[PDB]
Amino acid sequence: NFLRDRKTIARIAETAELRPDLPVLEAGPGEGLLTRELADRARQVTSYEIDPRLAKSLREKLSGHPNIEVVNADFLTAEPPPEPFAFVGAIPYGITSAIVDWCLEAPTIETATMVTQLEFARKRTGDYGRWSRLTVMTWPLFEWEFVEKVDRRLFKPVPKVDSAIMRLRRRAEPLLEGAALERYESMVELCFTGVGGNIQASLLRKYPRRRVEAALDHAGVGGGAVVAYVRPEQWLRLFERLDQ
């Protein structure tokens, strides 16, 4: 699926929050129009194309841009650069979670701007109230933002479902660090298993009743809340009170 709509392509490039001293890594470059717009704004673009024939034609198509390099390789086995950078990608359906993990694990990444299936982006950004476990776990380190829906008819060939632009931003200052962050991650893990039936019952496996009740109230969360509908700001408040 190749995005052809010029307005959406420009929206992606502007979403990436690029600047002249920041390099970009790109995956799923397709026709390379987006690559041109990224190269206009960033220090340089390194664009990954796994297919050797497509890599060669893309390299020639973009040879009028000296700050574009095309790498004939699988992006998923690429190492991130040891300097701040941004990722931009149009991600096929079957490797979306793996690309997200690639970005979450790159310690110098600033932003990751991705075109994904619509439902994937909504879950990972809580756009309709339901929250991914990974989003909650990484919220102290990353912002997850839903940018916009992208209608199927803007691609070629036209797919079956709609897409979306979503963005990760690595926070300049993490909301938690060190052992406190680990204690937060342990709390989130504990609650997403569902042991005991409800979030209150799960928390009671690790924390005293008096403190659990105080923490739920502090966070504005009911003892029987559906775990997936607790918001990240509520998880932080819950941990704040529990960790005293």
Numbering used by the authors: 42 to 285
Task: Provide excerpts from the study.
ErmE (EC 2.1.1.184) is a dimethyltransferase from the actinomycete Saccharopolyspora erythraea, from which the first macrolide antibiotic erythromycin was originally extracted. ErmE provides resistance to macrolide, lincosamide, and streptogramin B (MLS) antibiotics to S. erythraea. The bilobed structure of ErmE consists of an N-terminal Rossmann-like α/ß catalytic domain (residues 42–211) and C-terminal helical domain (residues 219–285), which are connected by a loop.
Here, we present the first crystal structure of rRNA methyltransferase ErmE, determined at 1.75-Å resolution. Only the truncated version of ErmE produced diffraction-quality crystals. The refined structure includes residues 42–285 of ErmE. The absence of ordered density for the N- and C-termini confirms the predicted flexibility of these regions. SEC analysis and examination of the structure in PDBe PISA33 confirm that ErmE is a monomer. The N-terminal domain shows an L-shaped pocket rich in conserved residues. Superposition of the catalytic domains of ErmE and ErmC’ in complex with SAM suggests that SAM will bind similarly in the lower part of the pocket, with the methyl group directed towards the upper part of the pocket, where the substrate adenine will likely bind. Interestingly, the substitution of Asn101 in ErmC’ with Ala131 in ErmE suggests that the carboxyl group of SAM will only be coordinated through a hydrogen bond to the main chain N of Leu44, while in ErmC’ the same carboxyl in addition hydrogen bond to Asn101 Nδ2. In the ErmE structure, a sulfate ion is bound between Lys164 and Arg174, possibly mimicking a substrate phosphate.
